Scaffold this active site. Structure first.
Site, PDB file in Angstrom:
ATOM      1  N   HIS A  85      28.078  51.765  38.627  1.00  0.00           N
ATOM      2  CA  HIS A  85      28.749  52.854  39.348  1.00  0.00           C
ATOM      3  C   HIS A  85      27.866  54.075  39.586  1.00  0.00           C
ATOM      4  O   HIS A  85      26.809  54.237  38.969  1.00  0.00           O
ATOM      5  CB  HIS A  85      30.019  53.289  38.608  1.00  0.00           C
ATOM      6  CG  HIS A  85      31.134  52.295  38.683  1.00  0.00           C
ATOM      7  ND1 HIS A  85      32.455  52.656  38.547  1.00  0.00           N
ATOM      8  CD2 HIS A  85      31.128  50.958  38.899  1.00  0.00           C
ATOM      9  CE1 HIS A  85      33.214  51.583  38.664  1.00  0.00           C
ATOM     10  NE2 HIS A  85      32.434  50.539  38.878  1.00  0.00           N
ATOM     11  N   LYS A 137      26.605  41.600  39.317  1.00  0.00           N
ATOM     12  CA  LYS A 137      25.531  42.084  38.450  1.00  0.00           C
ATOM     13  C   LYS A 137      25.712  41.600  37.010  1.00  0.00           C
ATOM     14  O   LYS A 137      24.794  41.023  36.424  1.00  0.00           O
ATOM     15  CB  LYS A 137      25.499  43.611  38.511  1.00  0.00           C
ATOM     16  CG  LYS A 137      24.303  44.271  37.855  1.00  0.00           C
ATOM     17  CD  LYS A 137      24.146  45.733  38.263  1.00  0.00           C
ATOM     18  CE  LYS A 137      25.385  46.580  38.006  1.00  0.00           C
ATOM     19  NZ  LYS A 137      26.251  46.723  39.213  1.00  0.00           N
ATOM     20  N   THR A 138      26.900  41.839  36.455  1.00  0.00           N
ATOM     21  CA  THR A 138      27.263  41.363  35.113  1.00  0.00           C
ATOM     22  C   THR A 138      27.534  39.854  35.107  1.00  0.00           C
ATOM     23  O   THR A 138      27.217  39.173  34.129  1.00  0.00           O
ATOM     24  CB  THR A 138      28.500  42.110  34.561  1.00  0.00           C
ATOM     25  OG1 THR A 138      28.262  43.523  34.595  1.00  0.00           O
ATOM     26  CG2 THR A 138      28.805  41.700  33.122  1.00  0.00           C
ATOM     27  N   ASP A 160      30.797  46.050  41.806  1.00  0.00           N
ATOM     28  CA  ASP A 160      31.445  44.742  42.025  1.00  0.00           C
ATOM     29  C   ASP A 160      30.636  43.789  42.932  1.00  0.00           C
ATOM     30  O   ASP A 160      31.142  43.298  43.947  1.00  0.00           O
ATOM     31  CB  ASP A 160      32.877  44.949  42.557  1.00  0.00           C
ATOM     32  CG  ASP A 160      33.800  45.611  41.532  1.00  0.00           C
ATOM     33  OD1 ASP A 160      33.940  45.077  40.410  1.00  0.00           O
ATOM     34  OD2 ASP A 160      34.404  46.659  41.855  1.00  0.00           O
TER      35      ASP A 160
HETATM   36  N1  GNP Z   1      33.112  33.723  44.749  1.00  0.00           N
HETATM   37  C1  GNP Z   1      32.161  34.368  44.025  1.00  0.00           C
HETATM   38  N2  GNP Z   1      32.491  35.548  43.423  1.00  0.00           N
HETATM   39  C2  GNP Z   1      31.584  36.243  42.682  1.00  0.00           C
HETATM   40  C3  GNP Z   1      30.225  35.698  42.534  1.00  0.00           C
HETATM   41  N3  GNP Z   1      29.543  36.564  41.766  1.00  0.00           N
HETATM   42  C4  GNP Z   1      30.386  37.578  41.449  1.00  0.00           C
HETATM   43  N4  GNP Z   1      31.599  37.385  41.993  1.00  0.00           N
HETATM   44  C5  GNP Z   1      32.766  38.295  41.851  1.00  0.00           C
HETATM   45  O1  GNP Z   1      32.384  39.672  41.946  1.00  0.00           O
HETATM   46  C6  GNP Z   1      33.191  40.484  41.079  1.00  0.00           C
HETATM   47  C7  GNP Z   1      32.296  41.485  40.328  1.00  0.00           C
HETATM   48  O2  GNP Z   1      31.961  41.062  39.001  1.00  0.00           O
HETATM   49  P1  GNP Z   1      30.892  41.817  38.055  1.00  0.00           P
HETATM   50  O3  GNP Z   1      29.566  41.115  38.223  1.00  0.00           O
HETATM   51  O4  GNP Z   1      31.496  41.906  36.674  1.00  0.00           O
HETATM   52  O5  GNP Z   1      30.776  43.319  38.643  1.00  0.00           O
HETATM   53  P2  GNP Z   1      29.372  44.111  38.562  1.00  0.00           P
HETATM   54  O6  GNP Z   1      28.466  43.576  39.601  1.00  0.00           O
HETATM   55  O7  GNP Z   1      28.717  43.880  37.115  1.00  0.00           O
HETATM   56  N5  GNP Z   1      29.547  45.828  38.827  1.00  0.00           N
HETATM   57  P3  GNP Z   1      30.492  46.800  37.727  1.00  0.00           P
HETATM   58  O8  GNP Z   1      30.483  46.156  36.395  1.00  0.00           O
HETATM   59  O9  GNP Z   1      29.875  48.280  37.625  1.00  0.00           O
HETATM   60  O10 GNP Z   1      32.005  46.893  38.267  1.00  0.00           O
HETATM   61  C8  GNP Z   1      34.007  39.520  40.210  1.00  0.00           C
HETATM   62  O11 GNP Z   1      35.394  39.585  40.566  1.00  0.00           O
HETATM   63  C9  GNP Z   1      33.424  38.143  40.486  1.00  0.00           C
HETATM   64  O12 GNP Z   1      34.417  37.110  40.490  1.00  0.00           O
HETATM   65  C10 GNP Z   1      29.942  34.408  43.217  1.00  0.00           C
HETATM   66  O13 GNP Z   1      28.813  33.883  43.135  1.00  0.00           O
HETATM   67  N6  GNP Z   1      30.927  33.819  43.921  1.00  0.00           N
HETATM   68 MG    MG Z   2      28.785  45.278  35.720  1.00  0.00          MG
HETATM   69 MG    MG Z   3      38.378  47.116  41.183  1.00  0.00          MG
END
Ligand code: GNP
Ligand code: MG
Ligand code: MG
Ligand code: PHE
Ligand code: MG
Ligand code: MG
Ligand code: MG
Ligand code: MG
Ligand code: MG
Ligand code: MG
Ligand code: MG
Ligand code: MG
Ligand code: MG
Ligand code: MG
Ligand code: MG
Ligand code: MG
Ligand code: MG
Ligand code: MG
Ligand code: MG
Ligand code: MG
Ligand code: MG
Ligand code: MG
Ligand code: MG
Ligand code: MG
Ligand code: MG
Ligand code: MG
Ligand code: MG
Ligand code: MG
Ligand code: MG
Ligand code: MG
Ligand code: MG
Ligand code: MG
Ligand code: MG
Ligand code: MG
Ligand code: MG
Ligand code: MG
Ligand code: MG
Ligand code: MG
Ligand code: MG
Ligand code: MG
Ligand code: MG
Ligand code: MG
Ligand code: MG
Ligand code: MG
Ligand code: MG
Ligand code: MG
Ligand code: MG
Ligand code: MG
Ligand code: MG
Ligand code: MG
Ligand code: MG
Ligand code: MG
Ligand code: MG
Ligand code: MG
Ligand code: MG
Ligand code: MG
Ligand code: MG
Ligand code: MG
Ligand code: MG
Ligand code: MG
Ligand code: MG
Ligand code: MG
Ligand code: MG
Ligand code: MG
Ligand code: MG
Ligand code: MG
Ligand code: MG
Ligand code: MG
Ligand code: MG
Ligand code: MG
Ligand code: MG
Ligand code: MG
Ligand code: MG
Ligand code: MG
Ligand code: MG
Ligand code: MG
Ligand code: MG
Ligand code: MG
Ligand code: MG
Ligand code: MG
Ligand code: MG
Ligand code: MG
Ligand code: MG
Ligand code: MG
Ligand code: MG
Ligand code: MG
Ligand code: MG
Ligand code: MG
Ligand code: MG
Ligand code: MG
Ligand code: MG
Ligand code: MG
Ligand code: MG
Ligand code: MG
Ligand code: MG
Ligand code: MG
Ligand code: MG
Ligand code: MG
Ligand code: MG
Ligand code: MG
Ligand code: MG
Ligand code: MG
Ligand code: MG
Ligand code: MG
Ligand code: MG
Ligand code: MG
Ligand code: MG
Ligand code: MG
Ligand code: MG
Ligand code: MG
Ligand code: MG
Ligand code: MG
Ligand code: MG
Ligand code: MG
Ligand code: MG
Ligand code: MG
Ligand code: MG
Ligand code: MG
Ligand code: MG
Ligand code: MG
Ligand code: MG
Ligand code: MG
Ligand code: MG
Ligand code: MG
Ligand code: MG
Ligand code: MG
Ligand code: MG
Ligand code: MG
Ligand code: MG
Ligand code: MG
Ligand code: MG
Ligand code: MG
Ligand code: MG
Ligand code: MG
Ligand code: MG
Ligand code: MG
Ligand code: MG
Ligand code: MG
Ligand code: MG
Ligand code: MG
Ligand code: MG
Ligand code: MG
Ligand code: MG
Ligand code: MG
Ligand code: MG
Ligand code: MG
Ligand code: MG
EC number: 3.6.5.3
Lengths: 393, 60, 205, 82, 85
Positions: A84, A24-25, A21
């Site tokens: 993860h 990354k995505t 979280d």
């Molecule tokens: N305010 C804010 N929130 C962000 C920003 N970038 C990501 N987030 C938050 O971080 C959370 C993680 O999103 P996501 O990128 O899908 O997770 P991930 O990094 O791919 N890891 P995984 O998919 O294994 O759980 C989301 O709830 C998103 O809203 C940003 O620039 N600003």
């Molecule tokens: Mg991800």
């Molecule tokens: Mg969660």
RNA sequence: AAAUUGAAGAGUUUGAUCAUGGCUCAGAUUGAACGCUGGCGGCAGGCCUAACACAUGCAAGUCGAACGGUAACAGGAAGAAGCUUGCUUCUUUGCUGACGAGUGGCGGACGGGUGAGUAAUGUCUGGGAAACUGCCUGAUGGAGGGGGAUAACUACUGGAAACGGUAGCUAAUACCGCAUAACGUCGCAAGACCAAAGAGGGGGACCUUCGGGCCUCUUGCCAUCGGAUGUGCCCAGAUGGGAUUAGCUAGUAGGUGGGGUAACGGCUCACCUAGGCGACGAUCCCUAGCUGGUCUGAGAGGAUGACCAGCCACACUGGAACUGAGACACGGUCCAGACUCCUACGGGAGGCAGCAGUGGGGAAUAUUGCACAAUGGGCGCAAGCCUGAUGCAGCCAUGCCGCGUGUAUGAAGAAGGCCUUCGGGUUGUAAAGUACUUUCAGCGGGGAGGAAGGGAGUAAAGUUAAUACCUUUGCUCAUUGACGUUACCCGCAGAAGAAGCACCGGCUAACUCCGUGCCAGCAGCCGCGGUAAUACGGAGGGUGCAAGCGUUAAUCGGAAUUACUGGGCGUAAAGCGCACGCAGGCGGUUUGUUAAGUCAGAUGUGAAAUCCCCGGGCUCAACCUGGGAACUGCAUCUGAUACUGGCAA
RNA sequence: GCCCGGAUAGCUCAGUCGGUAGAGCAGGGGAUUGAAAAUCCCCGUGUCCUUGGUUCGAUUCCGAGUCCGGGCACCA
């Protein structure tokens, strides 16, 4: 499957790396909407980067999704890795094909335990280059706090053995660039410039014969069974003899269409992710881990001598001795596999942080040659890197 | 149906998908089939030389 | 397709001389003939009624160099043809080109004649023929082509054919390697030892 | 419409045409009224090459039957006085 | 449908609009005769028969009706006029 | 001259025997599968199961010589405007060729696919009248003079799309009168009534009102009577299993009359009569496409109906009709349904049992290839366009068949293995070694035959006023192959790249030694293993087949073990407990007399392929192929009267 | 691609919250017989599914796997 892919601009395999979280995505989604708007490629959205029931009810990503964003200089092919600690296996396949990564550390949380584990896997497998991206920024409005996190990432890379200070760190919010903020849109256009400048043109092997490790198998409704993966060496012409080697046994086949992100191709060159359609093969009998080789080039083996470099407490691995019988996971090109260890005569125990050779009998046969690199892992962490010495079977 | 498992030693247990051909054993009353050694999850007999099409073993 | 094994072994099992390794020298005396088929050669066989039929079939096969599938097809032709079934079996075997090439004296052995036919040397009625099984019809003229004429293997092999009985049904020129197949072979002309009746018995059941 | 056309029998690369009196709607090889000679294009100069019974042609062409493009050429090939 | 000869669908529908009307016209003129038959002498019936005779013959020639249909509608219909009246 | 030359047994009950009687085996065979092992080629074949559901492209169009279109498009011609006056801009012109979209014609009903249903509506054999028949084709003779529409195109809107509406407008071989009609259609006849379409290639003469008229000739239309080919219908016999299905049946069975059908008919009605089928199997149930054939068999039979050919049936499931010469229409239409589908939520789609291909099912069965070059098919004067029909190619030892995988000499009777009475034997002329090939793959050059045609010209014929145009043509031109780096031929090179896998106790061809000890295992039948196993496992040695071999399944054979040819019933399985008796089967004897059976002859038919025999063609074979015989039959027709039947004594 | 269960001597099962696992039923050794079975006299015959870790010590607590069970998805 209609439009022919015109071979222009060099191909490069990129992918996002970082903590759970951490943006990354969301970075992958930000890169599409920014690059598609200004330059004028295909649009896409955050939707489909991760759909399913598994990546909606939870919100987390499991599968290594792929994206195709284009720029004036080069034609990139993204690999958004899961994140993860439990999904490290299917990540390593995404990370092995990836040439130059995009690390994702956050300005709020900072470098977290997985960020250390992800970069640790990048070195031992094969990740030449890496780029940092601070993915929060706006949440903490401060000049001193945000810059203190940049120091810890430069220390992390240099401690774990990378350039560190030479790597171009970028700051920018992913969510602010999703909508349409002029200051934050341009700050991720800057990341596309850092991707071109820092990472060089990759050195391919378009001479020595055809090989292609299978990352993920598909079954297209109408056409047949399909296999995806980066072509490690050589080329693929349509209507050519291809021998599938690896787990179970060995099967004859012929290619009937290669493709690149739902677009046709004549020749599937080296160092690029392509979907090869196979003739007269079922979804079940072909599996992940096997390799598409040209007939006669490679032979499957279940026993081999190998010079293994075990890691210590400091480098990050085991901290205790072990006798014959020990069974860790051996990650070759894509898949992992378990195997019993038979040590040489005149070696009572194997201490951590030591260079030795050893005979390893695997349960499944995998295609291999003399001079193949692998990374041993066991117990949710690394153990040691090494190379193959001799064939036996 | 019951099916006889020819050769010395086998990998069959609990489940494991096998292939069945015809042929009574003439000894176990009720058993009236033979498992094909070699086909599917039923592997070949270990360390066999003479008559290896029967018992599903490859060349040395 | 061919035997290509120990050829003089076949003669000891059968007992009589099969002309497999006839070759340059006349008589062998270099195998312990008759009394050593294999390891257990001193074992006197009981030899049943089916045995003597099988031994007779296998003898006629190994002399002419024919396998069971092709040999059983000669029987099926022999049965449909007129006259006697026994006399036709052997008449069709003698009509083969590899056999005629041996009987002309363009080959020390029948296997050498077979290779000579197969390797574009033999030619009949102004046409090259590769097939050993080629049924040589009455009134033909088999011969060797001028490229492979008077090579080292044929000239030495033709001198051997002077010691042989030499058939009446065919004639040979000997100067220019030219043969002439005239009529169909009679029973009483050739062999006078290999029994046909027992081979007709084996296939009828 | 009755038509006199070739049937195409023989092996692969080795054609042999059975010229035949058949209905237009019936298939090439299929139903016919009666066969009326034959044609062999891979015959060459030898004993036999082409035969065509001209008596039965008068029974059909005289009444009302078309002659196909190839069979019309073989009536010219067999000739009336050559 | 997956063909460019669907002209026949719109052509055959255009046909039966015409083809049903001329047929409907015919079978009403024939009904006109059966209406006259039952309670009527040889006068009103034969007038209707002379009117339909050209119409049934014409439609027989155009391929709507077959020539035997037309032949019967004279044959059996004259037998009503002759026998009863 | 040739068309069948054809009939085998063995093991197994017993201490042993003969019998009875099952069981098993030796042979053919296949749409096969599996295991092990795999070189080529040739010709064949290759979803039997889910008639399972299927994305994608593609499987039927075609003519401008029907018609408006002076054209959507690309290009010549009378003339125009720029300016490098032939370089460029550009309006007219059926006018350059053609043709996107129409309108009409003919096709789509053929050709492909599949066996779900069907036990008779079907199929087969042989007959039979109550019929229809586009295209083709015989003959006769028409084809004359009018009208009102209508698409396209606009014009104007509706719709997300599919697809419309409203205002004009216009063409025809589209459409409808009218005259015109008979050996035609109804009728007793007298009478009445019923049709048409025009096109295109050339012209001297004279009308020019220039749109030419009129000669011209192919072409097309239309009516009749015809052939040809189809097709619809009827009858007879034949065409599976079950009686643990014995009664079924009310438009049911027939009549009279009306309607309807191309045609006859409970086809369908109204009334009338009370039938009809049924033990020589109705009804009901289960199973099934049928035949030519295929396999098997000495034959009778038995089994089977993949491929090739004929017939039927069906097309997402259930219905209906429209159009048409033909369908109640695989890639038409209309509803309804289940399931997929796209949307702007109004409504729309869709139909692989055409060809590829996918998932699923399964023991199991293939390329989203090339090509119309040939052979048919579709339209068209043609040229051509169209064609997953066909012809090639891929794949697969799935079969049938050919050639491979070398060939001479070679004693020290080497080594090594294996056995031994340790003397030697055996593997074994096997190998190595020397002599030679070079098929087939591997290469490099040559290179047919599938190709007939269609043209460009011509020449005389045809045809006419004509040294024209089409009909026939013979002469000169340049061409037409998906297959195709073709078949086949040479050119090197070097034994070089090319052998397995069953079995070895009896049946049944082939034996020893170790290991194991009623364990592990083998087994087609009998049976092997309890510490000296020929049967188990390995080793050597042998035998039999060999690019195949075995195992499994499946059919017949042997099985005279459903016996018609050809068995039985005292005790082996098997005489009802014993009578009477209708239907049924059988019937003493002599005359008649028919001719049903029976017999003889004759004619028609029994599709072609297949089988069989004599030929012929692929280097040979398989394979292809000419002719013959055959197709054991069924029908009719004429006889024969012994026998059997009918019938009179 | 990821969630979840299942495995204990030859077979069928007991036993655990770190204190080092047992029961029947088999099997084997001797006696006897040609060999058995019963009779008589003696024996667990174990990689706690595999492997590592937390520890003095792991079947037992925590990872990683094995092959198998059942569950949810992705369409170059
Ligand atoms: N305010 C804010 N929130 C962000 C920003 N970038 C990501 N987030 C938050 O971080 C959370 C993680 O999103 P996501 O990128 O899908 O997770 P991930 O990094 O791919 N890891 P995984 O998919 O294994 O759980 C989301 O709830 C998103 O809203 C940003 O620039 N600003
Ligand atoms: Mg991800
Ligand atoms: Mg969660
Ligand atoms: N080369 C592939 C990468 C890919 C794999 C799997 C899913 C999606 C994308 C494209 O498409
Ligand atoms: Mg958080
Ligand atoms: Mg936090
Ligand atoms: Mg062969
Ligand atoms: Mg030799
Ligand atoms: Mg026989
Ligand atoms: Mg038909
Ligand atoms: Mg020719
Ligand atoms: Mg529609
Ligand atoms: Mg009305
Ligand atoms: Mg009409
Ligand atoms: Mg017998
Ligand atoms: Mg017997
Ligand atoms: Mg006994
Ligand atoms: Mg006895
Ligand atoms: Mg197979
Ligand atoms: Mg197999
Ligand atoms: Mg072929
Ligand atoms: Mg089927
Ligand atoms: Mg269905
Ligand atoms: Mg279906
Ligand atoms: Mg789609
Ligand atoms: Mg479709
Ligand atoms: Mg097309
Ligand atoms: Mg015109
Ligand atoms: Mg014109
Ligand atoms: Mg059809
Ligand atoms: Mg059809
Ligand atoms: Mg077919
Ligand atoms: Mg059928
Ligand atoms: Mg009939
Ligand atoms: Mg018509
Ligand atoms: Mg006509
Ligand atoms: Mg006329
Ligand atoms: Mg007019
Ligand atoms: Mg008007
Ligand atoms: Mg109008
Ligand atoms: Mg109007
Ligand atoms: Mg008008
Ligand atoms: Mg009309
Ligand atoms: Mg009309
Ligand atoms: Mg009038
Ligand atoms: Mg008039
Ligand atoms: Mg009359
Ligand atoms: Mg008149
Ligand atoms: Mg009159
Ligand atoms: Mg008119
Ligand atoms: Mg004109
Ligand atoms: Mg003029
Ligand atoms: Mg004329
Ligand atoms: Mg005409
Ligand atoms: Mg005409
Ligand atoms: Mg006409
Ligand atoms: Mg007519
Ligand atoms: Mg007629
Ligand atoms: Mg009709
Ligand atoms: Mg009837
Ligand atoms: Mg036969
Ligand atoms: Mg026979
Ligand atoms: Mg018999
Ligand atoms: Mg049948
Ligand atoms: Mg079929
Ligand atoms: Mg086929
Ligand atoms: Mg067919
Ligand atoms: Mg019919
Ligand atoms: Mg019918
Ligand atoms: Mg129907
Ligand atoms: Mg139908
Ligand atoms: Mg269908
Ligand atoms: Mg339909
Ligand atoms: Mg329908
Ligand atoms: Mg229907
Ligand atoms: Mg009609
Ligand atoms: Mg018409
Ligand atoms: Mg009809
Ligand atoms: Mg249709
Ligand atoms: Mg269809
Ligand atoms: Mg619908
Ligand atoms: Mg298909
Ligand atoms: Mg499939
Ligand atoms: Mg072309
Ligand atoms: Mg054609
Ligand atoms: Mg036409
Ligand atoms: Mg014409
Ligand atoms: Mg012409
Ligand atoms: Mg043509
Ligand atoms: Mg085509
Ligand atoms: Mg085809
Ligand atoms: Mg083969
Ligand atoms: Mg093969
Ligand atoms: Mg195979
Ligand atoms: Mg040698
Ligand atoms: Mg040489
Ligand atoms: Mg060659
Ligand atoms: Mg070559
Ligand atoms: Mg020519
Ligand atoms: Mg040619
Ligand atoms: Mg010409
Ligand atoms: Mg042509
Ligand atoms: Mg011309
Ligand atoms: Mg000309
Ligand atoms: Mg001319
Ligand atoms: Mg060439
Ligand atoms: Mg050659
Ligand atoms: Mg050479
Ligand atoms: Mg040499
Ligand atoms: Mg040399
Ligand atoms: Mg060799
Ligand atoms: Mg024991
Ligand atoms: Mg003993
Ligand atoms: Mg022993
Ligand atoms: Mg043995
Ligand atoms: Mg051996
Ligand atoms: Mg076989
Ligand atoms: Mg039988
Ligand atoms: Mg019998
Ligand atoms: Mg009897
Ligand atoms: Mg008896
Ligand atoms: Mg008794
Ligand atoms: Mg009794
Ligand atoms: Mg009695
Ligand atoms: Mg009694
Ligand atoms: Mg009784
Ligand atoms: Mg009686
Ligand atoms: Mg009587
Ligand atoms: Mg009597
Ligand atoms: Mg009497
Ligand atoms: Mg009389
Ligand atoms: Mg009679
Ligand atoms: Mg009779
Ligand atoms: Mg008779
Ligand atoms: Mg026939
Ligand atoms: Mg022949
Ligand atoms: Mg020949
Ligand atoms: Mg010949
Ligand atoms: Mg044949
Ligand atoms: Mg023939
Ligand atoms: Mg014939
Ligand atoms: Mg005859
Ligand atoms: Mg008399
Ligand atoms: Mg009498
Ligand atoms: Mg009498
Ligand atoms: Mg004991
Ligand atoms: Mg005991």
């Amino acid at each position: 499957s209609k439009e022919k892919f015109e071979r222009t601009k060099p191909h490069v395999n990129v992918g996002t790396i970082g903590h759970v979280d951490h943006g990354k995505t969301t970075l992958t989604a930000a890169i599409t909407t920014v690059l598609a708007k200004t330059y004028g490629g295909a649009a896409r959205a955050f939707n489909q980067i991760d759909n399913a029931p598994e990546e909606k009810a939870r919100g987390i990503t499991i599968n290594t999704s792929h994206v195709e964003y284009d720029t004036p200089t080069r034609h990139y092919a993204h690999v958004d890795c899961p994140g993860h600690a439990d999904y490290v296996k299917n990540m390593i396949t995404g990370a092995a094909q990836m040439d130059g990564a995009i690390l994702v550390v956050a300005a709020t949380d900072g470098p977290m335990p997985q960020t250390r584990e992800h970069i640790l896997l990048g070195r031992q497998v094969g990740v030449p280059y890496i780029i940092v991206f601070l993915n929060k920024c706006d949440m903490v409005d401060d000049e001193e706090l945000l810059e203190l996190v940049e120091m810890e990432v430069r220390e992390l890379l240099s401690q774990y053995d990378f350039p560190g200070d030479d790597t171009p760190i970028v700051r920018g919010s992913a969510l602010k660039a999703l909508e349409g903020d002029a200051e934050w849109e341009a700050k991720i256009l800057e990341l596309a410039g850092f991707l071109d400048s820092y990472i060089p043109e990759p050195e391919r092997a378009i001479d020595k014969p055809f090989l292609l490790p299978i990352e993920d198998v598909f079954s297209i409704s109408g056409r047949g069974t399909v296999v995806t993966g980066r072509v490690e060496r050589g080329i693929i012409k349509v209507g050519e003899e291809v021998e599938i080697v690896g787990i179970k046994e060995t099967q004859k086949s012929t290619c009937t269409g290669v493709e690149m992100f739902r677009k046709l191709l004549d020749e599937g060159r080296a160092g690029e992710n392509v979907g090869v359609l196979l003739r007269g093969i079922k979804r079940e009998e072909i599996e992940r881990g096997q390799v598409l080789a040209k007939p006669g080039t490679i032979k499957p083996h279940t026993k081999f001598e190998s010079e293994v470099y075990i890691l210590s407490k400091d480098e990050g691995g085991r901290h205790t001795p072990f006798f014959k019988g020990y069974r860790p996971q051996f990650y070759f090109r894509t898949t992992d596999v378990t195997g019993t260890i038979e040590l040489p005569e005149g070696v009572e125990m194997v201490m951590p942080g030591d260079n030795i050779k050893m005979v390893v009998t695997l349960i499944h046969p995998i295609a291999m040659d003399d001079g193949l690199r692998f990374a041993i892992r066991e117990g949710g962490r690394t153990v040691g890197a090494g190379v193959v010495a001799k064939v036996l079977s | 149906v019951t099916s006889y498992i020819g050769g010395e030693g086998h990998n069959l247990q609990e489940h494991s998908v096998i292939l069945i051909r015809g042929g009574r054993v003439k000894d176990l009353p009720g058993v009236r089939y033979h498992t094909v050694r070699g086909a599917l999850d039923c592997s070949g007999v270990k360390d066999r030389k003479q008559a290896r099409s029967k018992y599903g073993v490859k060349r040395p | 397709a061919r035997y290509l094994g120990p050829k003089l072994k076949l003669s000891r099992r059968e007992g009589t001389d099969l002309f497999l390794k006839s070759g340059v020298r006349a008589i062998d005396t270099k195998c312990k003939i008759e009394q050593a088929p294999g390891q257990h050669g001193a074992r006197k066989p009981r030899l049943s009624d089916y045995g003597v039929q099988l031994r007779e079939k296998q003898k006629v096969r190994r002399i002419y160099g024919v396998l069971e599938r092709q040999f059983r097809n000669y029987y099926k032709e022999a049965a449909r043809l007129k006259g006697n079934t026994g006399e036709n079996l052997l008449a069709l075997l003698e009509g083969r080109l590899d056999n005629v090439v041996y009987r002309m004296g363009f080959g020390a052995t029948r296997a050498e004649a077979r290779q000579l036919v197969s390797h574009k040397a033999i030619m009949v009625n102004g046409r090259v023929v590769n097939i050993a099984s080629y049924q040589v019809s009455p009134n033909d003229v088999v011969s060797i082509r001028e490229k492979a004429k008077k090579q080292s293997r044929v000239k030495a092999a033709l001198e051997l054919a002077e010691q042989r009985e030499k058939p009446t049904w065919l004639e040979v020129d000997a100067g220019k390697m030219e043969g002439t197949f005239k009529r169909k072979p009679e029973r009483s002309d050739l062999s006078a030892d290999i029994n046909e009746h027992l081979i007709v018995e084996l296939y009828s059941k | 419409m009755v038509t006199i056309r070739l049937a195409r029998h023989g092996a692969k690369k080795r054609p042999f045409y059975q010229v035949v009196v058949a209905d237009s709607r019936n298939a090439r090889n299929g139903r016919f009224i009666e066969r009326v000679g034959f044609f062999n294009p891979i015959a060459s100069e030898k004993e036999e090459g082409t035969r065509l019974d001209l008596d039965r042609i008068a029974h059909w062409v005289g009444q009302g039957a078309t002659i196909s493009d190839r069979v019309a050429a073989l009536i010219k090939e067999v000739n009336k006085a050559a | 449908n997956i063909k460019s000869a669907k002209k026949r669908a719109i052509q055959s529908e255009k046909a039966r609009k015409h083809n049903a009307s001329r047929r409907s016209m015919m079978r009403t003129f024939i009904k006109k005769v059966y209406a006259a038959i039952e309670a009527g002498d040889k006068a009103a019936a034969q007038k209707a028969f002379n009117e339909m005779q050209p119409i049934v013959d014409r439609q027989a020639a155009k391929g709507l009706i077959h020539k035997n249909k037309a032949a019967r509608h004279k044959a059996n219909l004259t037998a009503q006029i002759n026998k009863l009246a």
